[PDB]
Design a protein around this ligand. Sequence first.
Ligand SMILES: [Mg+2]
Ligand SMILES: [Mg+2]
Ligand SMILES: [Mg+2]
Ligand SMILES: [Mg+2]
Ligand SMILES: [Mg+2]
Ligand SMILES: [Mg+2]
Ligand SMILES: [Mg+2]
Ligand SMILES: [Mg+2]
Ligand SMILES: [Mg+2]
Ligand SMILES: [Mg+2]
Ligand SMILES: [Mg+2]
Ligand SMILES: [Mg+2]
Ligand SMILES: [Mg+2]
Ligand SMILES: [Mg+2]
Ligand SMILES: [Mg+2]
Ligand SMILES: [Mg+2]
Ligand SMILES: [Mg+2]
Ligand SMILES: [Mg+2]
Ligand SMILES: [Mg+2]
Ligand SMILES: [Mg+2]
Ligand SMILES: [Mg+2]
Ligand SMILES: [Mg+2]
Ligand SMILES: [Mg+2]
Ligand SMILES: [Mg+2]
Ligand SMILES: [Mg+2]
Ligand SMILES: [Mg+2]
Ligand SMILES: [Mg+2]
Ligand SMILES: [Mg+2]
Ligand SMILES: [Mg+2]
Ligand SMILES: [Mg+2]
Ligand SMILES: [Mg+2]
Ligand SMILES: [Mg+2]
Ligand SMILES: [Mg+2]
Ligand SMILES: [Mg+2]
Ligand SMILES: [Mg+2]
Ligand SMILES: [Mg+2]
Ligand SMILES: [Mg+2]
Ligand SMILES: [Mg+2]
Ligand SMILES: [Mg+2]
Ligand SMILES: [Mg+2]
Ligand SMILES: [Mg+2]
Ligand SMILES: [Mg+2]
Ligand SMILES: [Mg+2]
Ligand SMILES: [Mg+2]
Ligand SMILES: [Mg+2]
Ligand SMILES: [Mg+2]
Ligand SMILES: [Mg+2]
Ligand SMILES: [Mg+2]
Ligand SMILES: [Mg+2]
Ligand SMILES: [Mg+2]
Ligand SMILES: [Mg+2]
Ligand SMILES: [Mg+2]
Ligand SMILES: [Mg+2]
Ligand SMILES: [Mg+2]
Ligand SMILES: [Mg+2]
Ligand SMILES: [Mg+2]
Ligand SMILES: [Mg+2]
Ligand SMILES: [Mg+2]
Ligand SMILES: [Mg+2]
Ligand SMILES: [Mg+2]
Ligand SMILES: [Mg+2]
Ligand SMILES: [Mg+2]
Ligand SMILES: [Mg+2]
Ligand SMILES: [Mg+2]
Ligand SMILES: [Mg+2]
Ligand SMILES: [Mg+2]
Ligand SMILES: [Mg+2]
Ligand SMILES: [Mg+2]
Ligand SMILES: [Mg+2]
Ligand SMILES: [Mg+2]
Ligand SMILES: [Mg+2]
Ligand SMILES: [Mg+2]
Ligand SMILES: [Mg+2]
Ligand SMILES: [Mg+2]
Ligand SMILES: [Mg+2]
Ligand SMILES: [Mg+2]
Ligand SMILES: [Mg+2]
Ligand SMILES: [Mg+2]
Ligand SMILES: [Mg+2]
Ligand SMILES: [Mg+2]
Ligand SMILES: [Mg+2]
Ligand SMILES: [Mg+2]
Ligand SMILES: [Mg+2]
Ligand SMILES: [Mg+2]
Ligand SMILES: [Mg+2]
Ligand SMILES: [Mg+2]
Ligand SMILES: [Mg+2]
Ligand SMILES: [Mg+2]
Ligand SMILES: [Mg+2]
Ligand SMILES: [Mg+2]
Ligand SMILES: [Mg+2]
Ligand SMILES: [Mg+2]
Ligand SMILES: [Mg+2]
Ligand SMILES: [Mg+2]
Ligand SMILES: [Mg+2]
Ligand SMILES: [Mg+2]
Ligand SMILES: [Mg+2]
Ligand SMILES: [Mg+2]
Ligand SMILES: [Mg+2]
Ligand SMILES: [Mg+2]
Ligand SMILES: [Mg+2]
Ligand SMILES: [Mg+2]
Ligand SMILES: [Mg+2]
Ligand SMILES: [Mg+2]
Ligand SMILES: [Mg+2]
Ligand SMILES: [Mg+2]
Ligand SMILES: [Mg+2]
Ligand SMILES: [Mg+2]
Ligand SMILES: [Mg+2]
Ligand SMILES: [Mg+2]
Ligand SMILES: [Mg+2]
Ligand SMILES: [Mg+2]
Ligand SMILES: [Mg+2]
Ligand SMILES: [Mg+2]
Ligand SMILES: [Mg+2]
Ligand SMILES: [Mg+2]
Ligand SMILES: [Mg+2]
Ligand SMILES: [Mg+2]
Ligand SMILES: [Mg+2]
Ligand SMILES: [Mg+2]
Ligand SMILES: [Mg+2]
Ligand SMILES: [Mg+2]
Ligand SMILES: [Mg+2]
Ligand SMILES: [Mg+2]
Ligand SMILES: [Mg+2]
Ligand SMILES: [Mg+2]
Ligand SMILES: [Mg+2]
Ligand SMILES: [Mg+2]
Ligand SMILES: [Mg+2]
Ligand SMILES: [Mg+2]
Ligand SMILES: [Mg+2]
Ligand SMILES: [Mg+2]
Ligand SMILES: [Mg+2]
Ligand SMILES: [Mg+2]
Ligand SMILES: [Mg+2]
Ligand SMILES: [Mg+2]
Ligand SMILES: [Mg+2]
Length: 68
Amino acid sequence: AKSKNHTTHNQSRKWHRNGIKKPRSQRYESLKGVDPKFLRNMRFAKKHNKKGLKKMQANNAKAMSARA
RNA sequence: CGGCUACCCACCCGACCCGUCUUGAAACACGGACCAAGGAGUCUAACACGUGCGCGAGUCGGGGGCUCGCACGAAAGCCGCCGUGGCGCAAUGAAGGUGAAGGCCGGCGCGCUCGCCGGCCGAGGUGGGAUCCCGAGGCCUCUCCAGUCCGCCGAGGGGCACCACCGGCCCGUCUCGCCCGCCGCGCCGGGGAGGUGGAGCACGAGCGCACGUGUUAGGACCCGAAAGAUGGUGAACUAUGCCUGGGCAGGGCGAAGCCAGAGGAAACUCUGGUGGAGGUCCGUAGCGGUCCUGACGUGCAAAUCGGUCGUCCGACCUGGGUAUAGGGGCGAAAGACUAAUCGAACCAUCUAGUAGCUGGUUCCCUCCGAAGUUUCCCUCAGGAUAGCUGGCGCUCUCGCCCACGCAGUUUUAUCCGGUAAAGCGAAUGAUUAGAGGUCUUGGGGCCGAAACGAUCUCAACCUAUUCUCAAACUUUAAAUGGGUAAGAAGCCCGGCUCGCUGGCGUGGAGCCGGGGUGGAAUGCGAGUGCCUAGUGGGCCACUUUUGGUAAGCAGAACUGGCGCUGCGGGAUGAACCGAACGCCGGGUUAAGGCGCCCGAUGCCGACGCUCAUCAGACCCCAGAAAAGGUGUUGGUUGAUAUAGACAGCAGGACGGUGGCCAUGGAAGUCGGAAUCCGCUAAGGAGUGUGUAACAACUCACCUGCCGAAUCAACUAGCCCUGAAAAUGGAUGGCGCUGGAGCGUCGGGCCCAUACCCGGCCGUCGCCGGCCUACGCCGCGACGAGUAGGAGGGCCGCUGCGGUGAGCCUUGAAGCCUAGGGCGCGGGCCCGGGUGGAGCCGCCGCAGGUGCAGAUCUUGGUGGUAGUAGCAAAUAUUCAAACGAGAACUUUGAAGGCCGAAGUGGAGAAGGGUUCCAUGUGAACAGCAGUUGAACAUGGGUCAGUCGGUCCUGAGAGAUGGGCG
RNA sequence: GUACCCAUAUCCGCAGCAGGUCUCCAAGGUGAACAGCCUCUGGCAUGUUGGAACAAUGUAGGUAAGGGAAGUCGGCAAGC
RNA sequence: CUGUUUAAUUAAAACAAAGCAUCGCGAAGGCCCGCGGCGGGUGUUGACGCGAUGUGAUUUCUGCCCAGUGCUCUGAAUGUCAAAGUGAAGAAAUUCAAUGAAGCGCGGGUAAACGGCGGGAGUAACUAUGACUCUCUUAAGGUAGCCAAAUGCCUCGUCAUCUAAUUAGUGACGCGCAUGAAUGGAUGAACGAGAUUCCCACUGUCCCUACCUACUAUCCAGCGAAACCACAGCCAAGGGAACGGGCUUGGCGGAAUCAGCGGGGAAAGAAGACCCUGUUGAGCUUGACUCUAGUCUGGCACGGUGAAGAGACAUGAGAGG
RNA sequence: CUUCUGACCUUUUGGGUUUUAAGCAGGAGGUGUCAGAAAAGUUACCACAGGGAUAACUGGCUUGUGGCGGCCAAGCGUUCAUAGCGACGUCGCUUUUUGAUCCUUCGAUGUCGGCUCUUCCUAUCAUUGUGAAGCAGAAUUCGCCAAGCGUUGGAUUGUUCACCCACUAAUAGGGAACGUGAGCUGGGUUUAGACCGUCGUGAGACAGGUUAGUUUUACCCUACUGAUGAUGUGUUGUUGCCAUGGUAAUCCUGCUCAGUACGAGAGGAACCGCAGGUUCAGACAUUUGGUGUAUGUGCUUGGCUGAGGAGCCAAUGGGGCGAAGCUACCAUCUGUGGGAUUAUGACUGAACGCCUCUAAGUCAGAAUCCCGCCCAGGCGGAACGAUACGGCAGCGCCGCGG
Ligand SMILES: [Mg+2]
Ligand SMILES: [Mg+2]
Ligand SMILES: [Mg+2]
Ligand SMILES: [Mg+2]
Ligand SMILES: [Mg+2]
Ligand SMILES: [Mg+2]
Ligand SMILES: [Mg+2]
Ligand SMILES: [Mg+2]
Ligand SMILES: [Mg+2]
Ligand SMILES: [Mg+2]
Ligand SMILES: [Mg+2]
Ligand SMILES: [Mg+2]
Ligand SMILES: [Mg+2]
Ligand SMILES: [Mg+2]
Ligand SMILES: [Mg+2]
Ligand SMILES: [Mg+2]
Ligand SMILES: [Mg+2]
Ligand SMILES: [Mg+2]
Ligand SMILES: [Mg+2]
Ligand SMILES: [Mg+2]
Ligand SMILES: [Mg+2]
Ligand SMILES: [Mg+2]
Ligand SMILES: [Mg+2]
Ligand SMILES: [Mg+2]
Ligand SMILES: [Mg+2]
Ligand SMILES: [Mg+2]
Ligand SMILES: [Mg+2]
Ligand SMILES: [Mg+2]
Ligand SMILES: [Mg+2]
Ligand SMILES: [Mg+2]
Ligand SMILES: [Mg+2]
Ligand SMILES: [Mg+2]
Ligand SMILES: [Mg+2]
Ligand SMILES: [Mg+2]
Ligand SMILES: [Mg+2]
Ligand SMILES: [Mg+2]
Ligand SMILES: [Mg+2]
Ligand SMILES: [Mg+2]
Ligand SMILES: [Mg+2]
Ligand SMILES: [Mg+2]
Ligand SMILES: [Mg+2]
Ligand SMILES: [Mg+2]
Ligand SMILES: [Mg+2]
Ligand SMILES: [Mg+2]
Ligand SMILES: [Mg+2]
Ligand SMILES: [Mg+2]
Ligand SMILES: [Mg+2]
Ligand SMILES: [Mg+2]
Ligand SMILES: [Mg+2]
Ligand SMILES: [Mg+2]
Ligand SMILES: [Mg+2]
Ligand SMILES: [Mg+2]
Ligand SMILES: [Mg+2]
Ligand SMILES: [Mg+2]
Ligand SMILES: [Mg+2]
Ligand SMILES: [Mg+2]
Ligand SMILES: [Mg+2]
Ligand SMILES: [Mg+2]
Ligand SMILES: [Mg+2]
Ligand SMILES: [Mg+2]
Ligand SMILES: [Mg+2]
Ligand SMILES: [Mg+2]
Ligand SMILES: [Mg+2]
Ligand SMILES: [Mg+2]
Ligand SMILES: [Mg+2]
Ligand SMILES: [Mg+2]
Ligand SMILES: [Mg+2]
Ligand SMILES: [Mg+2]
Ligand SMILES: [Mg+2]
Ligand SMILES: [Mg+2]
Ligand SMILES: [Mg+2]
Ligand SMILES: [Mg+2]
Ligand SMILES: [Mg+2]
Ligand SMILES: [Mg+2]
Ligand SMILES: [Mg+2]
Ligand SMILES: [Mg+2]
Ligand SMILES: [Mg+2]
Ligand SMILES: [Mg+2]
Ligand SMILES: [Mg+2]
Ligand SMILES: [Mg+2]
Ligand SMILES: [Mg+2]
Ligand SMILES: [Mg+2]
Ligand SMILES: [Mg+2]
Ligand SMILES: [Mg+2]
Ligand SMILES: [Mg+2]
Ligand SMILES: [Mg+2]
Ligand SMILES: [Mg+2]
Ligand SMILES: [Mg+2]
Ligand SMILES: [Mg+2]
Ligand SMILES: [Mg+2]
Ligand SMILES: [Mg+2]
Ligand SMILES: [Mg+2]
Ligand SMILES: [Mg+2]
Ligand SMILES: [Mg+2]
Ligand SMILES: [Mg+2]
Ligand SMILES: [Mg+2]
Ligand SMILES: [Mg+2]
Ligand SMILES: [Mg+2]
Ligand SMILES: [Mg+2]
Ligand SMILES: [Mg+2]
Ligand SMILES: [Mg+2]
Ligand SMILES: [Mg+2]
Ligand SMILES: [Mg+2]
Ligand SMILES: [Mg+2]
Ligand SMILES: [Mg+2]
Ligand SMILES: [Mg+2]
Ligand SMILES: [Mg+2]
Ligand SMILES: [Mg+2]
Ligand SMILES: [Mg+2]
Ligand SMILES: [Mg+2]
Ligand SMILES: [Mg+2]
Ligand SMILES: [Mg+2]
Ligand SMILES: [Mg+2]
Ligand SMILES: [Mg+2]
Ligand SMILES: [Mg+2]
Ligand SMILES: [Mg+2]
Ligand SMILES: [Mg+2]
Ligand SMILES: [Mg+2]
Ligand SMILES: [Mg+2]
Ligand SMILES: [Mg+2]
Ligand SMILES: [Mg+2]
Ligand SMILES: [Mg+2]
Ligand SMILES: [Mg+2]
Ligand SMILES: [Mg+2]
Ligand SMILES: [Mg+2]
Ligand SMILES: [Mg+2]
Ligand SMILES: [Mg+2]
Ligand SMILES: [Mg+2]
Ligand SMILES: [Mg+2]
Ligand SMILES: [Mg+2]
Ligand SMILES: [Mg+2]
Ligand SMILES: [Mg+2]
Ligand SMILES: [Mg+2]
Ligand SMILES: [Mg+2]
Ligand SMILES: [Mg+2]
Ligand SMILES: [Mg+2]
Ligand SMILES: [Mg+2]
């Protein structure tokens, strides 16, 4: 009662049927796992961007449109 | 005259018997004698997903009620103040409980990491994103003005679905914090800011019906066990008691008791009779069954027969009645017997019990098409999980100087490794040998009373060297290989925000706006989701490799193949070498081959080698080495030959010197040291022949005749030796020798389903037409296939609603058919003949729906075959009769057997009319029959005194009683 | 109740199956005898068929010159 | 010894058996059955009996071990000790303590109860063998006997006899792998359908076969099946699932047959009884696991009357260091 | 599941207070078969579903082990490497030893040994023909062609093997599914009974020993043996031929040769021949012996026919003789030559001016081989005979024409 124990034959020819493609990798990669201190920085950074970035950036857009 | 045909026959070539387990099937693996009918994935519940329909934040009457009692009405219809209820619309906590809105602007409180107020909008934002919109400019017959109208658009705008990310909100917890509320001021509530767990929200998509697939529970694809439980039936065989009856020829051995005689003093002894005891001896019936391992062994028989046997007054044999009943009985004990069954009887039910295990698993065509691997399991014949497959789609991309994305690939850069190899005078580990040196000893020798007093030697040590190694060593270090990059997600500029960081407006991230896509080669359409079958027993080949002596052995790596696969070669084959398959006509080739089987060299083919008394003849491959050859053929390196070798013929083979060792010979000749010189042409102070010794003689050495190559080693091609196995045999055979062998090649030639060209069918894709739009044509690329999956079937069987002014007694169904056809088929249509009363087409619908098998079930018939076989116990013959008919019936005669423990005369149990007569001879009697126990008709069993009835026995059984 | 078989053909054994089954009566000769053999009373046609011939092998039986276990696991079988 | 047994493979050396032992029990008992009752059986019985075993005539014998394992007797002797009962803490559920039946452990006996019975080293005026001596050691270390046996591996042990020759048979030897005393040892007249060897007589068992009879078998008259059967049946070699009939290449091959014969058809019988797997079972056994009838105890009821003594509690007085 | 810890935690079901219990969060108590069942043995009385995924028997690959060889030459062999051996090493062959593997069969291939019987191999024990020896003769040893023909009788053990006695010319080695069970035998192994020893507390085990223990069927096809036959020649018969197949003869002794050769002697040959024998084959029955049912003859037991006479029955009643026939190595008879050649020995003669058996040529040469002699004669053929009345016929050769 003895059988062939382990092999890796006929494995590459199975793997390359559908193809060994890459893992997609879309834009704006997943941001979990990054440094919590940096993340606590960047969240308040974003919400205060969206808070105070109206007036002076609108001024600078008017200024750069007047220049060009 | 034409004709395909399931008619028959001839011929060439191909051609092993199907189904399944299997890596492998024609297998000396299993199932199948033949034929007809039956025969296997159904139904319900539940779930998931896809599909079709209706309604839609709803939906559903499936439970009831309502209508007159009408076949189809067990239908259908209605309810809505019948929505009770299911599922969903809201999740989350263990629970107490709690429970999804933000954005934009203006202002205030220190706008302070902070809260409040006022207005408006309303599910935030970033990058892609089908579509839509706008549009510079572009183009339509003289020049001006014209409008629709035409179409491409660089670029720009809003942006569906969906994807990716950030931000927001709810609930549970954790951390840090301060403020507010007051049916009552408290170990009371409410709130804030962060990081986390959630099956969440972030404008909802379900519900009902039906169909498909898959999974699970059910007898659940079909058949299959040894078992277990419940409840009953058996002691007619057998086991053992008990009761009541029955049975056992003759003989041999000769105890107790007795008698007589003799002896003795007594005790008692001796001799001859009588006597008839024995779990006693030979042997009959009876009972058993040892041996022949005899006969038989599809028998006479599901345990017999024939010889030969054991025991027969006994623990004997035996009939009837009666008792003991299944985990129980009984057992002189063998686990034997208990109705042909016993190491747990028989019958029915639970029961269609269970099975990871064998066997089977029924119509066609089209398309796609595997795996025998990872992990886990009391897992190792199995399952779950990934991987491989198929189906269903969906989202984009095309068509009208350049795209998106991708890659079993290369290049250009750039990293990584520690194997092949190499290395030890580089570490570690082993290891050979020589040389040099003088510190250290011990040990040898010598000068010496002794002294590192001096010296020689030894080992050890060190120094540079030298030979060989390493999977568990290494400085070095390949080839093959692995990753990344080769641009708009990128550059560059400018600015805002940050509680993070901090000399610094510093760093880093994020956000916003702007600017310029031509950034290696080559090829292609890509991305993505669901469901899920089969698979989880492998094997071979090149190369690299582990264990082993080795294997057609076991175990690995990379790639291919076989399995799942044909075809052309290797004769024959799974795996080899070419090459992969729709059906065909022409041409060409591949791998191979061209004496003849057998298509092609039937070339005035090229060059050489080899003769075998066992030749040789093509990867895998199907038998051979070490060694040797003056067999021949090349080749290498030397040595001789013109001042003549080489072998052949001819001449000699001395002298100082019978030199010396000896006096056994030796005057070169068994043995010993040696060894010079002269003459020459050269002689060896003599190789040997032979006289025991003296001697002729030769060899070494020398010279003539001679005429041109010769000698010695060594090497590799063919061939030979080495070479021996069982039935007679294998380059395939026949054969084959100026080849039909070996090696080198050439020119022609042969052919596979490969390639090309052309036709035809189908699939797929890309379309085209306002012609069954589910049809029609057009274009082009392709078609293999087991397990498996889908699609189509105007394939088929049976039934139901609809329809064909369907079909038929002027002949339907079914059956047969050397008849005519169609389709690639499933099958069908017509003709002809039987046949005698129902049948089909189409659109839907619903199934107990299609046979070769399952040692399938039932029914029938073959081959074997007019065969084996009608043989245990001696045996018949003649005449006559009745009769269609006489080996068997009956009578006579004759000859026989059974031979009184019978083949006789009568009974018990059992059988039930068989008893008897008459009549028949169809079937039965295993041949026949006038016969019978066969069939048909009709008869026969007479009792106070024969027995049952009556009695009790072994026992069985009722009331009283007790238990249940 | 009373027939009949009571068994190599009326029972059981799947049957007209050499199997099995309970008892009584039992002559003459030989002989010890109901031993085996032959007759008599009393039954019977040879046991589910016949004819022709006399091969092998058989199955049952019987002899053998010399030697007497040499055969064979064994004197098994047969013979004394 | 006679007897009996596995009917349908064994006839025995097995079984019983008389004889010998051993054990329980004086009836409110032993040993059993039974679902149940003082229901049955032994029992219509009473130790010369009933019940349960071992051994197996007589004759002669019955050795040594209580360590293990059983069995048994003994005492609340004292550790362990279950319900119920007592007492304490607590609002109570509950908790704790003391007391403590059987049994277990402690102690005694038993081997005609199961069973068991050593190995070294030296040592005698030729060598060997070794009575003796020392040591470790167990509970005891095989005593009387007996043997290459039915028990002895090595093994065809060694010697003698038997035969020409003997792995056989007998007789003796004994540090006997691993003999042995009721697990019975050793003899032993009679008898074994028991097993083995040799001798005499006898013979077809043989050298060596031959013949004869009966019944078949043969042919014919009649009447006639069954097993089995993919297809059918000539061989060599090769390859192949590795030993073809069928494939390939060769050898070759005439219809239809009868009587034989057993080489083949890996013939036919039978889903291998040997082996392995199964998470398939049944017999059995015990110091496997989980239980249970039966049984031994303790408690509570049925369950009463009379007398006496005490353990300890309840109360207070006196001694008490 | 238990246990412990943490919160002024939650729930403890009509509402409260307290005990208790449940819960959240995180630590421990174990699953060593370690992703975790709680677990002893035996079956020879066994059963069931299966496996050739998996042993025992053969077959196949392999050749360590076994057996059989070859090369080199240190030595042994009085001297002397190779007459005969040969270490140290080394290369092979064999499948008759054992082992390895699991490829085939587990819905069965009957398993050891013996008896009988056929054929084959050669790695030759003897015989024929030869060569070499440390071959004087004899007796041996080693080689070559060579498997034609032989290779026995017995005691033991079941044996293969082994060992022994005796014969012999010699007691060679093997294969064919470890040939051969529808041929036997069943002694052993290998069931169920039983005993003994060891082991196990036990059911029981023991390639430890002893003993008793059912061996099935052929009529199918092929093969083989034997017998009818079948095709063509018109029929049919006689006489025959031979293609092909089969093959059988073999060995020893005595007497002369001769106690001669040879040998110091002890010892001791060979050829031709002449007698026989062994083994085998083919016959045959005059003799000898069997057989005996001419049921031939004559005794004889018991019974039967009244008795003598004649007979009969007793599964051929017994035994005494015995015809014919069948038969025996238990009687007798017969068994035979030609050719090419192998091994070897030579001749002539080059290669190689010599030599040489070889290179071309030749010769002698045998139990081998083939044929003769001897068996059977084919989908093989000859030569010859007669070739169909009766009453028409019928049938042949020749000529025809339709
Ligand atoms: Mg596997
Ligand atoms: Mg299987
Ligand atoms: Mg296999
Ligand atoms: Mg097949
Ligand atoms: Mg089959
Ligand atoms: Mg069959
Ligand atoms: Mg049918
Ligand atoms: Mg509601
Ligand atoms: Mg059970
Ligand atoms: Mg039961
Ligand atoms: Mg019952
Ligand atoms: Mg009875
Ligand atoms: Mg007696
Ligand atoms: Mg006697
Ligand atoms: Mg007798
Ligand atoms: Mg008798
Ligand atoms: Mg009997
Ligand atoms: Mg009998
Ligand atoms: Mg028999
Ligand atoms: Mg027979
Ligand atoms: Mg007697
Ligand atoms: Mg039972
Ligand atoms: Mg029975
Ligand atoms: Mg079923
Ligand atoms: Mg069933
Ligand atoms: Mg597995
Ligand atoms: Mg797919
Ligand atoms: Mg490495
Ligand atoms: Mg290396
Ligand atoms: Mg499936
Ligand atoms: Mg599997
Ligand atoms: Mg392998
Ligand atoms: Mg394998
Ligand atoms: Mg497969
Ligand atoms: Mg493939
Ligand atoms: Mg292929
Ligand atoms: Mg081919
Ligand atoms: Mg080939
Ligand atoms: Mg082929
Ligand atoms: Mg073509
Ligand atoms: Mg070519
Ligand atoms: Mg040709
Ligand atoms: Mg050469
Ligand atoms: Mg040849
Ligand atoms: Mg296809
Ligand atoms: Mg009618
Ligand atoms: Mg129709
Ligand atoms: Mg029809
Ligand atoms: Mg129906
Ligand atoms: Mg059906
Ligand atoms: Mg059918
Ligand atoms: Mg089928
Ligand atoms: Mg069948
Ligand atoms: Mg049938
Ligand atoms: Mg039939
Ligand atoms: Mg016959
Ligand atoms: Mg017949
Ligand atoms: Mg008869
Ligand atoms: Mg008449
Ligand atoms: Mg008449
Ligand atoms: Mg008759
Ligand atoms: Mg008689
Ligand atoms: Mg009678
Ligand atoms: Mg009849
Ligand atoms: Mg009549
Ligand atoms: Mg009558
Ligand atoms: Mg009647
Ligand atoms: Mg009267
Ligand atoms: Mg009376
Ligand atoms: Mg009663
Ligand atoms: Mg009467
Ligand atoms: Mg009878
Ligand atoms: Mg009888
Ligand atoms: Mg009488
Ligand atoms: Mg009388
Ligand atoms: Mg008298
Ligand atoms: Mg009869
Ligand atoms: Mg005789
Ligand atoms: Mg005689
Ligand atoms: Mg005699
Ligand atoms: Mg013997
Ligand atoms: Mg006898
Ligand atoms: Mg006699
Ligand atoms: Mg009895
Ligand atoms: Mg018997
Ligand atoms: Mg009693
Ligand atoms: Mg005694
Ligand atoms: Mg004792
Ligand atoms: Mg004690
Ligand atoms: Mg208590
Ligand atoms: Mg005491
Ligand atoms: Mg001594
Ligand atoms: Mg002793
Ligand atoms: Mg003798
Ligand atoms: Mg003997
Ligand atoms: Mg002992
Ligand atoms: Mg003992
Ligand atoms: Mg034939
Ligand atoms: Mg063959
Ligand atoms: Mg092969
Ligand atoms: Mg073969
Ligand atoms: Mg062979
Ligand atoms: Mg066959
Ligand atoms: Mg053929
Ligand atoms: Mg025949
Ligand atoms: Mg036969
Ligand atoms: Mg089976
Ligand atoms: Mg398993
Ligand atoms: Mg059983
Ligand atoms: Mg409560
Ligand atoms: Mg309450
Ligand atoms: Mg695990
Ligand atoms: Mg068990
Ligand atoms: Mg037993
Ligand atoms: Mg296998
Ligand atoms: Mg095998
Ligand atoms: Mg088979
Ligand atoms: Mg068989
Ligand atoms: Mg066979
Ligand atoms: Mg021969
Ligand atoms: Mg054999
Ligand atoms: Mg036997
Ligand atoms: Mg035996
Ligand atoms: Mg036995
Ligand atoms: Mg016997
Ligand atoms: Mg035949
Ligand atoms: Mg001939
Ligand atoms: Mg005579
Ligand atoms: Mg005579
Ligand atoms: Mg006579
Ligand atoms: Mg007389
Ligand atoms: Mg007279
Ligand atoms: Mg007379
Ligand atoms: Mg008479
Ligand atoms: Mg007579
Ligand atoms: Mg003869
Ligand atoms: Mg010659």
